[PDB]
Design a protein around this ligand. Structure first.
Ligand code: NA
Length: 129
């Protein structure tokens, strides 16, 4: 599924991501924009041979199992394929664990390089939330 911006903002809010670990909804929508372009089916191979899955490009190195990332962990206890569903519940549940791990949203390099410090409010502008 390719979410609309406000559609994804509504879904993230419903699943309690708005102001989760102090990160406003616009931060999460901005991360999703630059990680996946709001596409739940997005997959990208990392240089280390891990893969990033779904709207928030969760990495098989630590968070989900894909069966092909040697010496990796599954800290969200989910198949990486579950992170490509049209229903973002699994991605949100896992993102809550990632952002709680100690470095906040710096875990998402695209958030750090493209969202951090910016007018992230713009990403929820016009949305009926
Ligand atoms: Na893994």
């Amino acid at each position: 599924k390719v979410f609309g911006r406000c559609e994804l903002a509504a879904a993230m809010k419903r699943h309690g991501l708005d102001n989760y670990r102090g990160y406003s909804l616009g931060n999460w929508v901005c991360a999703a924009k630059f990680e996946s372009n709001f596409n739940t089916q997005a997959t990208n191979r990392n240089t280390d041979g891990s893969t990033d899955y779904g709207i928030l490009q969760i990495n098989s190195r630590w968070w989900c199992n894909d069966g092909r990332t040697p010496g990796s962990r599954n800290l969200c206890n989910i198949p990486c394929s579950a992170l490509l569903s049209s229903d973002i519940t699994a991605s949100v549940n896992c993102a809550k664990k990632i952002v709680s791990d100690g470095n906040g949203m710096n875990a998402w390099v695209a958030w750090r390089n493209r969202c951090k410090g910016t007018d992230v409010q713009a990403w929820i502008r016009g949305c009926r939330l």
